[PDB]
């Protein structure tokens, strides 16, 4: 296959580099495009004959030229050419541009009860979101009253943004017959050493 | 000039899979080779094959045994038909195009392999034996007391993915959609939510409008307030 | 309605004539060329 570093980052205002490499780069034309976590990815170098990107040629390589990079551009670079045949063409292991001192985001938590119509639908999904945060790590527990639950909690994994940050969901799996019968909930995120607890009840509003 | 795409959704084991890519909109359409490319959940992008007009299409090593690309130009559309569909073959599909600029002949080679500029927004393809399953949204009423905030629970779905908008699709500035978790039960289930402040809180009728684009069962549930 | 075409390489020097001693170098020419005829006779031969 084509071969591509893993990764090279650099601090924002300097220039990062993303190379290709392979067998058909002796007698082809390399193209590259940048894809964004679940995003379609982003065409940027073309075949144009016989504004911040540009690909150099090296024997049997080619080098990408990111001057000056941000925020936006933290995503992942597939470089791409075709065959000497030309009966295929193929792309690279992708490169994750990560922009370096990002800033430390904390976690923003929204907690909600079950609705009117689940409890008469015997479920209780209860929902603690979290949004706008920096670097892509939390860490959640979740505390019936004071005390922890065992069985019932699901979460899914960091997604990056609009905004380039991070966000994520969680919810606990109970009974109609369990959200009445305690005193309160509370959601619970860790993020980088800091966090915050959200109280709702089955007798508040 | 606008790509679109029309298929199932979700696959079953060692049956046959089938695709769509339509041509709404385009001057130059004969011109390319039309082609497919897949990725895995959060991986890389791998490429089919594409097929020219004129029929000669062009495939990958592999899947020689599995596939072949038509064409009804009559749209124009071209069509993938693959076999042998497994478990490993889950992922996002998204159909492309291969550009072919030339500038006055073609057989003595005065052309090139522009690239794959264009391409689709992605249906996912998910292998499997297990059953759709159209959703069952539920009210996260909001806050009573201005800026407040609310949402809308979707759970008990199957397969990926569901993608949403409010108010008929007037809001995506200051939005949240957030991911869905496949309950240990083997559904799917997510959430949804508006920045939606607190004075209007009295005399609107805010809807919120779900699509399950695997189930063809879109939906119109009123998230009403918290009484 | 469209055409077709013939692929032509394009040579200078030659040794035409079987003048045994005598092979010389065309002038490149400026601007594109064009030439144009009526296509009127052919040289062909068979088999046994």
């Given at each position: 296959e084509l071969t591509q570093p893993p990764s090279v980052s650099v601090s924002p205002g300097q220039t990062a580099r993303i190379t290709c490499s392979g067998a058909p780069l002796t007698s082809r034309f390399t193209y590259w495009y940048r894809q964004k976590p679940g995003q379609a990815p982003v065409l940027i170098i073309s075949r144009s004959s016989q504004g911040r990107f540009s690909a150099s040629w090296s024997g049997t390589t080619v080098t990408l030229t990111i001057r000056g990079v941000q925020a936006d551009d933290e995503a992942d670079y597939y470089c791409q050419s075709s065959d000497t045949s030309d009966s295929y063409k193929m792309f690279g292991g992708g490169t994750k541009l990560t922009v370096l001192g990002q800033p430390a985001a904390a976690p923003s938590v929204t907690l909600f009860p079950p609705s009117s119509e689940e409890l008469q639908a015997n479920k209780a999904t209860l929902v603690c979101l979290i949004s706008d945060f920096y670097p892509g790590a939390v860490t959640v527990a979740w505390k019936a009253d004071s005390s922890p639950v065992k069985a019932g909690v699901e979460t899914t994994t960091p997604s990056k943004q609009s905004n380039n940050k991070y966000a994520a969901s969680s919810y606990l799996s109970l009974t109609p017959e369990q959200w009445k019968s305690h005193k309160s909930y509370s959601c619970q995120v860790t993020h980088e050493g800091s966090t915050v607890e959200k109280t709702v009840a089955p007798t508040e509003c | 000039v606008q790509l679109r795409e029309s298929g199932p959704g979700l696959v079953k084991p060692s049956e046959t899979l089938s695709l769509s890519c339509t041509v709404s909109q385009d001057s130059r359409p004969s011109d390319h080779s039309w082609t497919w490319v897949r990725q895995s959940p959060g991986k890389a992008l791998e490429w089919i094959g594409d097929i020219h007009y004129n029929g000669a299409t062009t495939y990958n090593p592999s899947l020689r045994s599995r596939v072949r690309i038509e064409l009804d130009?009559?749209?124009?559309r071209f069509s993938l038909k693959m076999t042998s569909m497994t478990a490993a073959d889950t992922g996002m599909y998204y159909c492309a195009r291969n550009a072919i600029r030339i500038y006055g002949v073609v057989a003595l080679g005065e052309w090139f392999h522009y690239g794959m500029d264009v391409w689709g927004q992605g249906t996912a393809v998910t292998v499997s034996s297990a059953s759709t399953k159209g959703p069952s949204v539920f009210p996260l009423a909001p806050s009573s007391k201005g800026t407040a905030a609310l949402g809308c629970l979707v759970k008990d779905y199957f397969p990926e993915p569901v993608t949403v908008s409010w108010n008929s699709g007037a809001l995506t500035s200051g939005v949240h959609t957030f991911p869905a978790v496949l309950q240990s039960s083997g559904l799917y289930s997510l959430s949804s939510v508006v920045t939606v402040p607190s004075s209007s809180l009295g005399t609107q009728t805010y809807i919120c409008n779900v699509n399950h684009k695997p189930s063809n069962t879109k939906v119109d549930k009123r998230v009403e307030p918290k009484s | 309605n469209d055409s077709i075409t013939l692929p032509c390489r394009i040579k200078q020097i030659i040794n035409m004539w079987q003048r045994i001693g005598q092979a010389m170098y065309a002038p490149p020419i400026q601007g594109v060329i064009r030439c144009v005829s009526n296509i009127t006779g052919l040289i062909l031969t068979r088999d046994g």
């Amino acid at each position: 296959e084509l071969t591509q570093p893993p990764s090279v980052s650099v601090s924002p205002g300097q220039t990062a580099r993303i190379t290709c490499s392979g067998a058909p780069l002796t007698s082809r034309f390399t193209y590259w495009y940048r894809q964004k976590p679940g995003q379609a990815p982003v065409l940027i170098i073309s075949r144009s004959s016989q504004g911040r990107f540009s690909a150099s040629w090296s024997g049997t390589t080619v080098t990408l030229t990111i001057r000056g990079v941000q925020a936006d551009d933290e995503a992942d670079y597939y470089c791409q050419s075709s065959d000497t045949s030309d009966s295929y063409k193929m792309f690279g292991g992708g490169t994750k541009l990560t922009v370096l001192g990002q800033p430390a985001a904390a976690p923003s938590v929204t907690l909600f009860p079950p609705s009117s119509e689940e409890l008469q639908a015997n479920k209780a999904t209860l929902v603690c979101l979290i949004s706008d945060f920096y670097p892509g790590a939390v860490t959640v527990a979740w505390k019936a009253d004071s005390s922890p639950v065992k069985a019932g909690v699901e979460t899914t994994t960091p997604s990056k943004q609009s905004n380039n940050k991070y966000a994520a969901s969680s919810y606990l799996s109970l009974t109609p017959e369990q959200w009445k019968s305690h005193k309160s909930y509370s959601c619970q995120v860790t993020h980088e050493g800091s966090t915050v607890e959200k109280t709702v009840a089955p007798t508040e509003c | 000039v606008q790509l679109r795409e029309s298929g199932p959704g979700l696959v079953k084991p060692s049956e046959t899979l089938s695709l769509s890519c339509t041509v709404s909109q385009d001057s130059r359409p004969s011109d390319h080779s039309w082609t497919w490319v897949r990725q895995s959940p959060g991986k890389a992008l791998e490429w089919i094959g594409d097929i020219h007009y004129n029929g000669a299409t062009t495939y990958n090593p592999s899947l020689r045994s599995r596939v072949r690309i038509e064409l009804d130009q009559s749209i124009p559309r071209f069509s993938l038909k693959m076999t042998s569909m497994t478990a490993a073959d889950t992922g996002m599909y998204y159909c492309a195009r291969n550009a072919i600029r030339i500038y006055g002949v073609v057989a003595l080679g005065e052309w090139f392999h522009y690239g794959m500029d264009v391409w689709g927004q992605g249906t996912a393809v998910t292998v499997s034996s297990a059953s759709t399953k159209g959703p069952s949204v539920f009210p996260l009423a909001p806050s009573s007391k201005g800026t407040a905030a609310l949402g809308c629970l979707v759970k008990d779905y199957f397969p990926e993915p569901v993608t949403v908008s409010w108010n008929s699709g007037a809001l995506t500035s200051g939005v949240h959609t957030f991911p869905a978790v496949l309950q240990s039960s083997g559904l799917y289930s997510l959430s949804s939510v508006v920045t939606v402040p607190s004075s209007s809180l009295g005399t609107q009728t805010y809807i919120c409008n779900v699509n399950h684009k695997p189930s063809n069962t879109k939906v119109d549930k009123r998230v009403e307030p918290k009484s | 309605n469209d055409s077709i075409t013939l692929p032509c390489r394009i040579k200078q020097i030659i040794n035409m004539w079987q003048r045994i001693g005598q092979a010389m170098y065309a002038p490149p020419i400026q601007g594109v060329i064009r030439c144009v005829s009526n296509i009127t006779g052919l040289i062909l031969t068979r088999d046994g």
